[PDB]
PDB file of C-alpha atoms in Angstrom:
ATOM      1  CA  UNK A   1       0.000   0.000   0.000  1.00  0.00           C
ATOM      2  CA  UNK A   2       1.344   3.282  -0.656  1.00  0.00           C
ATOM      3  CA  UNK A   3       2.823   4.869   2.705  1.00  0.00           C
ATOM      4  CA  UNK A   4       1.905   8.379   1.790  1.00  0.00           C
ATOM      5  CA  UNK A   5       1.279  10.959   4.598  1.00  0.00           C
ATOM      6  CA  UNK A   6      -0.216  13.501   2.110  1.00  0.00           C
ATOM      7  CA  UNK A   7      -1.241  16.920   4.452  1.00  0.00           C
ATOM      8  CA  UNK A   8      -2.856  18.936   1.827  1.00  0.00           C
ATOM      9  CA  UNK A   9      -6.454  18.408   3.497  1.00  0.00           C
ATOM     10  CA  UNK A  10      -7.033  15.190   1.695  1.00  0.00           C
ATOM     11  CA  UNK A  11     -10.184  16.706  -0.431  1.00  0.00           C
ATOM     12  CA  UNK A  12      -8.422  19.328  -2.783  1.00  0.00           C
ATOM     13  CA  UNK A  13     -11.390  20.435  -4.241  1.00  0.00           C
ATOM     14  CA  UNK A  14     -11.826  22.359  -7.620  1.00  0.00           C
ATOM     15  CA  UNK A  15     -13.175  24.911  -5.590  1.00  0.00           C
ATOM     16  CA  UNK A  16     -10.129  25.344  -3.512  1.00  0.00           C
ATOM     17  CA  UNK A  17      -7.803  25.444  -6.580  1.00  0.00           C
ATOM     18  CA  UNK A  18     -10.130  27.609  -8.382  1.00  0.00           C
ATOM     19  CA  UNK A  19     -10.059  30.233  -5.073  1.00  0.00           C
ATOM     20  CA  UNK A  20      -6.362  30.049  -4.640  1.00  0.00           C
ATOM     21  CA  UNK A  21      -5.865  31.053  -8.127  1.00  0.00           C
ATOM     22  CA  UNK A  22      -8.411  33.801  -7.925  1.00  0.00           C
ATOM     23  CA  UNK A  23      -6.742  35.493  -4.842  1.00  0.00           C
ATOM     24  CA  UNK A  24      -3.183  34.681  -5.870  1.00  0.00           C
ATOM     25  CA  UNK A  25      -3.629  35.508  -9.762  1.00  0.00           C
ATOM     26  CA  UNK A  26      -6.747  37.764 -10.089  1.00  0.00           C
ATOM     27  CA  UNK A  27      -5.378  39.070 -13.483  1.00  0.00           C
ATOM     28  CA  UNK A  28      -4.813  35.742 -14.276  1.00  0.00           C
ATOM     29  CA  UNK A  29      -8.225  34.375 -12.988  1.00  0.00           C
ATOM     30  CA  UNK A  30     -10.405  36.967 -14.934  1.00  0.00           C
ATOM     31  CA  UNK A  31      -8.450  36.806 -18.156  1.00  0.00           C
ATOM     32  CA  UNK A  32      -7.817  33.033 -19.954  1.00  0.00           C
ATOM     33  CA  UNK A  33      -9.716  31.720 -17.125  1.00  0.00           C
ATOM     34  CA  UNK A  34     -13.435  31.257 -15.882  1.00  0.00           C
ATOM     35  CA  UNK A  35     -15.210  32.745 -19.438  1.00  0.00           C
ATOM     36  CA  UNK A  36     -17.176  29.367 -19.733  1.00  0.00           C
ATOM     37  CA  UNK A  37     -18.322  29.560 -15.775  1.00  0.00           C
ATOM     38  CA  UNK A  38     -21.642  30.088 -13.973  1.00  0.00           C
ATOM     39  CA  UNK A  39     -20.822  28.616 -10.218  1.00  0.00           C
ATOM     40  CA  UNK A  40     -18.344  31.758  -9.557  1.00  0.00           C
ATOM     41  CA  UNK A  41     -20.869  32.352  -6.635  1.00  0.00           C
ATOM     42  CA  UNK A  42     -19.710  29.065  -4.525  1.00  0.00           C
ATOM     43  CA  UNK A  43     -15.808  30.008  -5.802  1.00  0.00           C
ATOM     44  CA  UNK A  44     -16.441  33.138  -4.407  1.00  0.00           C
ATOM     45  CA  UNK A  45     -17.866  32.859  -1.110  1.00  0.00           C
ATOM     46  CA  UNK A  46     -14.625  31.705   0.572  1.00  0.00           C
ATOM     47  CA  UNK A  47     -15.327  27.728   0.284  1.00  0.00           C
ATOM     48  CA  UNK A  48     -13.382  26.353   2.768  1.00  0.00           C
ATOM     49  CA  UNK A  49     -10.708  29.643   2.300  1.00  0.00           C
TER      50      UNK A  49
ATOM     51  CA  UNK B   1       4.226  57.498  26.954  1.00  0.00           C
ATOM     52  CA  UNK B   2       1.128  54.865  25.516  1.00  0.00           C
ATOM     53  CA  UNK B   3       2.599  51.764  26.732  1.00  0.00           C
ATOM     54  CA  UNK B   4       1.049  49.963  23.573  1.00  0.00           C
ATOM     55  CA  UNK B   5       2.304  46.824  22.101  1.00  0.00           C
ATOM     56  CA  UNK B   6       0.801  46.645  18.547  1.00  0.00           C
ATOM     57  CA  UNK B   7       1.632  43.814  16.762  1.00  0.00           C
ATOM     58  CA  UNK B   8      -0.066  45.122  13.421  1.00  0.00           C
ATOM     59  CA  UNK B   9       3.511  45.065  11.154  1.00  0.00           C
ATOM     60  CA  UNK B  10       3.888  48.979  12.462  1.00  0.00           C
ATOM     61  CA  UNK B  11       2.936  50.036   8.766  1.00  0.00           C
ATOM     62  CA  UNK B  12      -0.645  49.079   7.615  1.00  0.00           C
ATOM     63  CA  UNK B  13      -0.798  50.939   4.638  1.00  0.00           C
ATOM     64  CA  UNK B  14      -3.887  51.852   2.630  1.00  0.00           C
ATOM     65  CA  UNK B  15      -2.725  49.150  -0.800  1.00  0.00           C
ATOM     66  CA  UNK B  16      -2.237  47.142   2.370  1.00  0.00           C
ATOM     67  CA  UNK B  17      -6.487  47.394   3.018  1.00  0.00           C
ATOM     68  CA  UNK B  18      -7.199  47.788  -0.342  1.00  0.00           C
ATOM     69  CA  UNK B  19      -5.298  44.791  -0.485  1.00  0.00           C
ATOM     70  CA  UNK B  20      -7.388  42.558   1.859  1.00  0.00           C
ATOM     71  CA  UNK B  21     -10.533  43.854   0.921  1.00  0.00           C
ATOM     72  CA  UNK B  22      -9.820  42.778  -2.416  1.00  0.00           C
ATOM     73  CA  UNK B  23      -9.083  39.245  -1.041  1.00  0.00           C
ATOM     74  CA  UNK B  24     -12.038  38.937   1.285  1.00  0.00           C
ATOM     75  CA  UNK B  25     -14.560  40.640  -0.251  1.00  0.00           C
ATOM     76  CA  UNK B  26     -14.168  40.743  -4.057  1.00  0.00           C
ATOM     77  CA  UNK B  27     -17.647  41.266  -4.846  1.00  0.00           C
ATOM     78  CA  UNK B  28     -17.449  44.116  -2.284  1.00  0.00           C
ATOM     79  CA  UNK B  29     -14.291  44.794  -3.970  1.00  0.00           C
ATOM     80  CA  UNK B  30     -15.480  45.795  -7.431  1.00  0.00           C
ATOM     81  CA  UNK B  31     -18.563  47.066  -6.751  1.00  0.00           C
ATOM     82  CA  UNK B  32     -18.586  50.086  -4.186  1.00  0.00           C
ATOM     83  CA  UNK B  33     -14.800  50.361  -4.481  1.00  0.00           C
ATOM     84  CA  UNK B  34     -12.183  51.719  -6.344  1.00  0.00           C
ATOM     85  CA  UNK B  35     -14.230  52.856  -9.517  1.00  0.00           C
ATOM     86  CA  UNK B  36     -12.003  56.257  -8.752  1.00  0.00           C
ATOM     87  CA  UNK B  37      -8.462  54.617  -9.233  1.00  0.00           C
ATOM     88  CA  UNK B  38      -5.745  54.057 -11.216  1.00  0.00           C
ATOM     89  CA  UNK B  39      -2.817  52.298  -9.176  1.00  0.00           C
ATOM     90  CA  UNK B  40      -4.526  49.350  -9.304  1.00  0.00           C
ATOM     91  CA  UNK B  41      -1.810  47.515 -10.499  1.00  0.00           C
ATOM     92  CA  UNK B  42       0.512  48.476  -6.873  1.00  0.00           C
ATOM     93  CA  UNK B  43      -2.838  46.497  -4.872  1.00  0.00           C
ATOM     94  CA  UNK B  44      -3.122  43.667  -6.901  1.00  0.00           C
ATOM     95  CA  UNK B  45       0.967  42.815  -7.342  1.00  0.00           C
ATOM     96  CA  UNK B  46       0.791  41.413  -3.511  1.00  0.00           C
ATOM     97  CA  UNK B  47       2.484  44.466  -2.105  1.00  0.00           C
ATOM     98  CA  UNK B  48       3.474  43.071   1.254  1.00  0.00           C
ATOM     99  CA  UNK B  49       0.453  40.117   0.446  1.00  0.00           C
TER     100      UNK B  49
END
């Protein structure tokens, strides 16, 4: 079995990735990302921040 | 003398605010907020993130 003692929250959610990039990168986040989106409102609403 | 012990960095500039709010509250961010600016770019390069 593997022995991994991964301690990234175990869930890593879209959500979460989606977030991280929208407070890291914002010009990044609005620009070549989310154009094709309607659930911004979950993304945005600090989900699990 | 004030015998305060602030433990708040000492600096807490306004891009530092502007900053967090734009963090936080994005929606709040946008909307309400900095429709008079133009150093937008200083806030959103992580000045002192």
């Amino acid at each position: 079995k593997p022995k991994v003692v991964r301690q990234i929250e175990d869930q890593l959610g879209m959500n979460h990735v989606l977030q991280s990039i929208r407070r890291n990168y914002p010009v990044l986040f609005d620009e070549h990302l989310t154009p094709f989106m309607n659930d911004l409102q979950v993304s945005r609403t600090m989900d699990s921040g």
